[PDB]
Scaffold this active site. Sequence first.
Site, PDB file in Angstrom:
ATOM      1  N   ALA A   1     125.781 -77.791  93.894  1.00 55.01           N
ATOM      2  CA  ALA A   1     126.273 -77.004  95.027  1.00 55.01           C
ATOM      3  C   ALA A   1     127.744 -77.285  95.334  1.00 55.01           C
ATOM      4  CB  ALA A   1     125.417 -77.237  96.278  1.00 55.01           C
ATOM      5  N   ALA A   2     128.508 -77.702  94.323  1.00 52.47           N
ATOM      6  CA  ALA A   2     129.950 -77.824  94.505  1.00 52.47           C
ATOM      7  C   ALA A   2     130.563 -76.465  94.808  1.00 52.47           C
ATOM      8  CB  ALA A   2     130.592 -78.435  93.262  1.00 52.47           C
ATOM      9  N   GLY A   3     130.068 -75.419  94.144  1.00 56.92           N
ATOM     10  CA  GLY A   3     130.566 -74.081  94.412  1.00 56.92           C
ATOM     11  C   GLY A   3     130.355 -73.662  95.854  1.00 56.92           C
ATOM     12  N   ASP A   4     129.234 -74.085  96.451  1.00 58.55           N
ATOM     13  CA  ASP A   4     129.010 -73.792  97.864  1.00 58.55           C
ATOM     14  C   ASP A   4     130.111 -74.405  98.721  1.00 58.55           C
ATOM     15  OD1 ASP A   4     126.708 -72.320  97.368  1.00 58.55           O
ATOM     16  OD2 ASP A   4     125.374 -74.055  97.582  1.00 58.55           O
TER      17      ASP A   4
HETATM   18  N1  LIG Z   1     134.309 -82.620  88.445  1.00 60.98           N
HETATM   19  C1  LIG Z   1     135.142 -81.815  89.146  1.00 60.98           C
HETATM   20  N2  LIG Z   1     136.458 -82.108  89.269  1.00 60.98           N
HETATM   21  C2  LIG Z   1     137.305 -81.324  89.958  1.00 60.98           C
HETATM   22  N3  LIG Z   1     136.911 -80.197  90.574  1.00 60.98           N
HETATM   23  C3  LIG Z   1     135.622 -79.786  90.533  1.00 60.98           C
HETATM   24  C4  LIG Z   1     134.639 -80.587  89.799  1.00 60.98           C
HETATM   25  N4  LIG Z   1     133.455 -79.956  89.920  1.00 60.98           N
HETATM   26  C5  LIG Z   1     133.659 -78.842  90.667  1.00 60.98           C
HETATM   27  N5  LIG Z   1     134.958 -78.742  91.029  1.00 60.98           N
HETATM   28  C6  LIG Z   1     135.566 -77.664  91.849  1.00 60.98           C
HETATM   29  O1  LIG Z   1     134.523 -76.920  92.494  1.00 60.98           O
HETATM   30  C7  LIG Z   1     134.526 -75.556  92.050  1.00 60.98           C
HETATM   31  C8  LIG Z   1     133.104 -75.097  91.789  1.00 60.98           C
HETATM   32  O2  LIG Z   1     132.580 -75.708  90.626  1.00 60.98           O
HETATM   33  P1  LIG Z   1     131.260 -75.099  89.936  1.00 60.98           P
HETATM   34  O3  LIG Z   1     130.377 -76.266  89.538  1.00 60.98           O
HETATM   35  O4  LIG Z   1     131.680 -74.067  88.912  1.00 60.98           O
HETATM   36  O5  LIG Z   1     130.506 -74.353  91.148  1.00 60.98           O
HETATM   37  P2  LIG Z   1     129.018 -73.763  90.958  1.00 60.98           P
HETATM   38  O6  LIG Z   1     128.184 -74.514  91.972  1.00 60.98           O
HETATM   39  O7  LIG Z   1     129.183 -72.297  91.267  1.00 60.98           O
HETATM   40  O8  LIG Z   1     128.663 -74.050  89.515  1.00 60.98           O
HETATM   41  C9  LIG Z   1     135.452 -75.469  90.833  1.00 60.98           C
HETATM   42  O9  LIG Z   1     136.230 -74.284  90.838  1.00 60.98           O
HETATM   43  C10 LIG Z   1     136.344 -76.704  90.948  1.00 60.98           C
HETATM   44  O10 LIG Z   1     137.603 -76.371  91.525  1.00 60.98           O
END
Ligand SMILES: Nc1ncnc2c1ncn2[C@@H]1O[C@H](COP(=O)(O)OP(=O)(O)O)[C@@H](O)[C@H]1O
Lengths: 306, 306, 303, 304, 305, 306
Positions: free
Chosen positions: A253-256
Amino acid sequence: HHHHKIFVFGSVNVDVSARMAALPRPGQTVNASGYGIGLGGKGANQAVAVAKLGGAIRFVGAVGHDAFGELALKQMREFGLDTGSVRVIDDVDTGMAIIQVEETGQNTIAVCAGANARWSSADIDAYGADIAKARITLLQREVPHEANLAVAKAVRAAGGTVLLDPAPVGDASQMADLIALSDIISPNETEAAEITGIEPTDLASAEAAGRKLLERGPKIVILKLGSRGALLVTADEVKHFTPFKVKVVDTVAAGDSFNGGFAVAFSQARPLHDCVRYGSAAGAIAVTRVGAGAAAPTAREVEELI
Amino acid sequence: HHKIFVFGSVNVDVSARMAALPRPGQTVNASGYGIGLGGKGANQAVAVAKLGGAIRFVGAVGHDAFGELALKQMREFGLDTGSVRVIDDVDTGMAIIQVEETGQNTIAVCAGANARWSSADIDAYGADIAKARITLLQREVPHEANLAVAKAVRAAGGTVLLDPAPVGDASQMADLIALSDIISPNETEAAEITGIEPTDLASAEAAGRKLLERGPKIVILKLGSRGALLVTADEVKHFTPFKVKVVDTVAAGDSFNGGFAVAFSQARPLHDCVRYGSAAGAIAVTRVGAGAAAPTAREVEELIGR
Amino acid sequence: HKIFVFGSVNVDVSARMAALPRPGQTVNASGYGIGLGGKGANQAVAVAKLGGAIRFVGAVGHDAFGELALKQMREFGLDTGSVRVIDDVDTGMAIIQVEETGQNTIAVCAGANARWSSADIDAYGADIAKARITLLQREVPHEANLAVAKAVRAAGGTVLLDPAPVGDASQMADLIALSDIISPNETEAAEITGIEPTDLASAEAAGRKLLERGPKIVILKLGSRGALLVTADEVKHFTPFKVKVVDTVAAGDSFNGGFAVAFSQARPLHDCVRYGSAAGAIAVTRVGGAAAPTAREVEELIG
Amino acid sequence: HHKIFVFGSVNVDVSARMAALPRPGQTVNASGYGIGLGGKGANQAVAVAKLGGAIRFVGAVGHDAFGELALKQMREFGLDTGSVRVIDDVDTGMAIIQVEETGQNTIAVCAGANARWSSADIDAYGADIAKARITLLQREVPHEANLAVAKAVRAAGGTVLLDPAPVGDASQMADLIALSDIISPNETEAAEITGIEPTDLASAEAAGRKLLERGPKIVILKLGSRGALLVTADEVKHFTPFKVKVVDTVAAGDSFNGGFAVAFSQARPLHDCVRYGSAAGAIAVTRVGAGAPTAREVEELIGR
Amino acid sequence: HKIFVFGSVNVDVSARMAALPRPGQTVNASGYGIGLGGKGANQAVAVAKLGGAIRFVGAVGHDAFGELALKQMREFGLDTGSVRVIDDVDTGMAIIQVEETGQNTIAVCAGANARWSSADIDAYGADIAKARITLLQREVPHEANLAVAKAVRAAGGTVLLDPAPVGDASQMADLIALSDIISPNETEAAEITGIEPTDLASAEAAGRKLLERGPKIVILKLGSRGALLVTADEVKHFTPFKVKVVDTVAAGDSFNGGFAVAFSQARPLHDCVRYGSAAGAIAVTRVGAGAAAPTAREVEELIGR
Amino acid sequence: HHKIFVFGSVNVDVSARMAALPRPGQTVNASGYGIGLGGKGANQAVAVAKLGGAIRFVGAVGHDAFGELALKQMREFGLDTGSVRVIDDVDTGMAIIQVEETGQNTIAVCAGANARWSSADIDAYGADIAKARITLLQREVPHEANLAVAKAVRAAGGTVLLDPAPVGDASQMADLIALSDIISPNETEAAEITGIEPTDLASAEAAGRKLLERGPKIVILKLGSRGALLVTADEVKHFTPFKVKVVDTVAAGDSFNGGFAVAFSQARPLHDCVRYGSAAGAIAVTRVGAGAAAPTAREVEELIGR
Ligand SMILES: Nc1ncnc2c1ncn2[C@@H]1O[C@H](COP(=O)(O)OP(=O)(O)O)[C@@H](O)[C@H]1O
Ligand SMILES: Nc1ncnc2c1ncn2[C@@H]1O[C@H](COP(=O)(O)OP(=O)(O)O)[C@@H](O)[C@H]1O
Ligand SMILES: Nc1ncnc2c1ncn2[C@@H]1O[C@H](COP(=O)(O)OP(=O)(O)O)[C@@H](O)[C@H]1O
Ligand SMILES: Nc1ncnc2c1ncn2[C@@H]1O[C@H](COP(=O)(O)OP(=O)(O)O)[C@@H](O)[C@H]1O
Ligand SMILES: Nc1ncnc2c1ncn2[C@@H]1O[C@H](COP(=O)(O)OP(=O)(O)O)[C@@H](O)[C@H]1O
Ligand SMILES: Nc1ncnc2c1ncn2[C@@H]1O[C@H](COP(=O)(O)OP(=O)(O)O)[C@@H](O)[C@H]1O
Ligand SMILES: [Cl-]
Ligand SMILES: [Cl-]
Ligand SMILES: [Cl-]
Ligand SMILES: [Cl-]
Ligand SMILES: [Cl-]
Ligand SMILES: [Cl-]
Ligand SMILES: [Cl-]
């Protein structure tokens, strides 16, 4: 106090997470080393992310009249989210997900719509005042399509901004007309692969995937590339945003968090570039921890990283 | 201070019906779910209570909502919960059950407060064990606490009914079986403890005679669709199953053990006791779950007269 | 056959002298005697001479001491037909040297007693099944004792266990769990339960501890203070009979044979403890046993 | 008849191999045991019998189980037990030797029937002693009985081979030695009788010549690993030991005296008699326990 | 030399009178005589007069009686080189009072005869080794007789023992055990064995009792009835020679000398006993010991008659 | 490099005036006839050219006499024909108009070259479309071709003015309207698209707000003799009609769209663009024919200043 410049409409779940040595095979019983129950759902998660980052937030979702619903409301308010606009439906179960995680990190999820599946295009008319005055409006795909459509129509009618998280992709054609009413769309590698057919294998193919999304209604495309940063694509520019170097722990949920952080900068009238960077920093801090509750990024943590 | 004493686990079962179980890494949409009382100890204590037996139940739950729900449902079924420990800083045991349309299930069990039991703790119940004409045990709580209960009964000249489920480490339970006056394994547990698979009445007897060597004087092989097989040093009797409509056979053994326990405390002949359990198991398969659909004395007596 | 005894057969080389010899010393012995020995044969003989219907199962070597043991068994009334004679092994044997004050030194060779295996016991499955009571001791391999106990359990019989010598306490916690009756003395109960039975108050405590380990009946042999019966349902003190004490060795082995005989005859439990109590008291009044208590003697003492 | 006559103690030897001797009050375990015929009298009598000697052995046993077994062992060794007195109301002689894994031994010996002999008891064998070309004695029966036997041999002009073992009362045996024609002490006994420690051939001759002063005409010092030394008024000869693989040297002296007595009874030269005992002793060390060398083995070693 | 004699040397003071004196009385005697005596000297002189090669070891004082003893022995053919002469000691001497009826009374001072010690015998180890036969009596210290008997035993020689005077029967038990030949008379055999030899049957039984005590050859001197040879192999009675009897004193000493002399000459055992028998008979025909002592010519004439 | 891009149909109009429309099987005489340029594509392009706008027109004609005629008349009206595709093996589009003296019209239309347009054929004009400030589409060419142009404009961040005429299948063009930034329906077309009949300014507005829900940001309801209504998320303004001597109202909407486009391409305020097309519509009805007689900048400004 502060007027509500961000309106989020989406699902509310109670997540039942278990950690175990090995996922159970079909027909098998296994033991788990522990479990937790906390607030979940793409709607409530993004609304909470906006709240922890200082945004003036109005979250609209549905829980059932049951013990899990009382838990979801109690958490959201513990997370500074006003629950006045959260519907409580008697005679329906609160949405809830079963998350099973093994040592290696592999996991299985099963989601019950519960109170989330009761939304109708008619139920949205009751919030048209809040929607019409909202600077930006966040949607996901964990609620009935006719309800998301009703919100998007209302936003166009008021001339606001619809940020769409096209997750889960689901019926890609059914969301073609939702994307047409969206002003901003933030697909990750998988979602952009299904919507456009173009796998963003690198930054040149991800730009082609974004330019295809420009043909479908959105004016701003923000390709979430996880560890490889983010790509901002518009008719007038393409800018790669370098990922922030952090200790990765749990990337769920990083995208969230990304959408929330973007929406807070957007509600603050910050330039588009600052909005993407604020979202990318919120996501970066979201991976350094486990869960998106009290461990959700705050303004103080994000701005120090920037 | 009651004539029947059950010591064992208390779970909360989070059951989730769905079309297909999630493959590793997969998200799935379930059609619905329920939350209710589970655990072998709470099942069997509830089975005794619904059959009118005078029972004292000893188990543990956390000081969390799932603990509150387990206590409340226990009372709803006629079980007095005054001897149930409520341990702070420990989660109530819980099981994540995923149920497919075809029928294949998948269970993940967290020990929870059930693992907090020690041999020291059992001394606080030496009074209730003394007055007990029978004591039911299972294998979902620390072994040292099961053993401590067994020693109290044997010093008091009472009777121990051991359900050897799950088998776990068969060598560790060798001493628990040694102190067990009655043992009631089903097909799988008999095959794992003795190494003889009860494929027929001839072999099932042989597995039972292998169990007589290990301390029990009465063995009750539960054979599901084929009834039960009483084996002792003096007799072998096969108890035919009752013709009933089969719906959900889960925990049919738990109702069989409470049926036996109640008839036993009532000073009924041994054969009658096994029949009572055989009928109570039969009713248990005609409905879904144990809960408030657990067999009653009225229903059991009706099935024997039929 | 209603009583089955599976135990050790020894030949006891007993020597008496005014002072025990120190290392490297040579002393003169005022005399010596040789007689049948071993906890198994002693109990088996005590049952025989008391009128029990017994089958003794023991091992002796195929040497002169083996023929001495078998000969002395037959003269005490014991049918030796089930006593294995093993080639290329010595009979069990124990040297006892006794000083004037009583300080004695013992050296025991297991001999044929160590040759028993758990598989060897299948040859006696029919005997064990028909037996109303089965007497076991701790002078044969643990695996062989467990085989016998498992046989009795399957058949619903009763296992009378004399936990002697106590030996490895942990190894025999599972032999106790398959025992119906256990008959420890003062020293043996002390090691097993950790409670010294120095009086009847603490003796009951130790006996209750043993009830937690599988036996349903505990008979504490208390030497000059009688015996104590401890069960889940009662505690009774069986006072000793007043008798002139001469030599108290293996009085417990006549007590267990007396209990076995009364039990095999279906007498009440209290009557069985008293019958064993009398047999023990009769044993102390004589030396060794070639004069093992008889039914006639025991009945006279009870009246 | 029976040119060779032996009189002495009959024992049964219970020997127990074990690791650490029992402390007072302790119960130890022993790896194993053997049981066999014992006593210097029976040992030497069996040595003569297995070497082809015409032997009449006289000894006492009790009327108990160890008596029957002592008699049974004698017969299997080829020894006639018709003259072994069986006394009712007395224990057979017996010893309990408990060896250690380090070597220490604790020995307890019950004299038994052997202590019952008197000087009067010997008169029943006045006939046999008279026919005896040679008469073997030891120090394991009552002294009064040893003297009585010696008087009988002297009165008939026979020969008395005395093994002065165990020495016991060195003073009490000054008058048994005087009736002895041949004496065969080993190093320890010669030292305790004469006061001269036989460490080397010269000092061993000095010890033997002092023994010649006390009545014996022939002295045979058994020097163990270095052979034996013949000492008389007319000659001194060293008899080198035979090279053999030593295993257990206990009671090799008894095989020596028996071998000598068999050659002496056959009227072999004195040197041949000593060499026959030297060979019989050499074989006895190569094995464990009695039935003891045979005539075929002794000759094989002498001519090897 | 081939014959060794260790024993006493006395000067005998023999006085004849009608009646012995009662306590306190003083009585006249009819005469007296002074001459050589003692069992050691008497047997030594008999051997010398019969021709045997003899070495005599005895002790006399450095007084007149010593010089008399020494002169007499040389007068009878006995070399006196090995006779000790000790200062500060009186020569051994006996007081003999003889009635006219035959009875007599004797009181003996040991004198120099008592000075012998076991240590003193080491000086004669050479002479003892060369001896074929060695004659002993009971008139010297016992430890000294033993020392000699041990030297003979170790050397492989022969110890003729005259068990006289008997004295302490237990003390001489271990002297007899080292003695190869023993020649008791009737009375001495009686006290040693307990059997009175009143005839040849009982005399043999007394001899066989002595055969149990170590000696190989027993010669029972029977006085007027001859002698009896008793060994493990034979019993032979040697009749006495017919002779006119005058004085039988010390006839046994001449018998022991006769046997010794014939033994050293390697004559058969029977001939040695007969040689002693003849010498003993000659001694009784005359009066005294040294003067009456037979000679080789006298013995051979009697044996050939 | 032109600031206005028009894509649409090209027709040759064969207009015949007679006293009575012939009945089937009947042959009547016509008083006169004329042959001129037509089609909503060419009409809007010509009006743009005649009002001074810099326009690139894209349409298709056949390689026949009517193709030469249409091209000749386009060049007369000031229109550069360099980008008009000429297709061999297909006739030029043509309508056959028979109009009575009474005033009853009768039209038969052959699609001709206009129907050959495909979505792929549009890729040849991506350069022109990207540089266009505003782009005018109508509903007289294949739908997938119009959608292709609209996607190209969205990618380039341009502006798409849609004339939803003829409405035809309103459901078909809901996805074209989503890509349309400005839409200019008359009363009949608004009623079909939304369902609301614009009988007055209240109902006209309500239809305009309903059209904002479908993606367009600016709605211009052409009300004919009652003026036009501008409807956006921020404002509603009624533009009163200019008083003019009505003669022939045919294709007045095409002149209205051309006027708006020209004033839009010169960056005049939004109100000044709506009134520019209001005036160009008013002049267009005072005369007959939208070719040489199309309104001009001098005419339009003179009316606005009258
Ligand atoms: N390991 C990481 N290091 C730096 N930025 C990150 C990392 N993981 C996620 N992000 C940031 O969070 C955003 C969402 O990542 P992502 O995993 O693609 O979301 P989702 O939950 O939609 O898969 C990315 O655009 C990035 O900027
Ligand atoms: N299909 C059935 N029909 C009738 N009785 C049944 C049926 N299944 C179970 N029972 C009764 O319930 C008891 C328990 O059955 P089983 O399923 O073997 O126990 P467990 O659930 O522990 O495996 C049986 O002994 C039987 O009497
Ligand atoms: N002096 C005694 N007087 C009476 N009874 C005795 C006496 N000694 C032993 N007994 C009886 O024999 C039994 C065994 O005594 P104990 O010495 O404990 O046997 P063990 O040899 O097994 O130790 C006792 O229970 C008692 O009844
Ligand atoms: N190692 C040996 N090698 C050869 N001969 C031996 C050996 N040991 C003993 N003998 C012979 O056996 C005789 C007795 O030996 P010894 O042990 O001295 O007797 P004892 O056992 O009486 O002391 C010796 O005189 C010798 O001749
Ligand atoms: N009267 C005699 N007639 C013949 N021979 C005699 C006579 N007296 C002694 N003899 C001889 O002398 C020897 C010693 O006599 P005996 O009186 O025994 O000596 P003693 O008594 O001095 O020892 C006798 O063996 C005998 O041979
Ligand atoms: N009679 C008129 N007077 C003034 N303006 C007119 C008149 N007719 C048309 N217009 C202008 O032209 C525009 C288009 O008219 P309309 O009839 O809607 O054309 P169409 O129906 O062909 O789309 C109107 O919005 C208006 O401004
Ligand atoms: Cl609250
Ligand atoms: Cl509702
Ligand atoms: Cl011979
Ligand atoms: Cl052979
Ligand atoms: Cl010479
Ligand atoms: Cl032209
Ligand atoms: Cl073409």
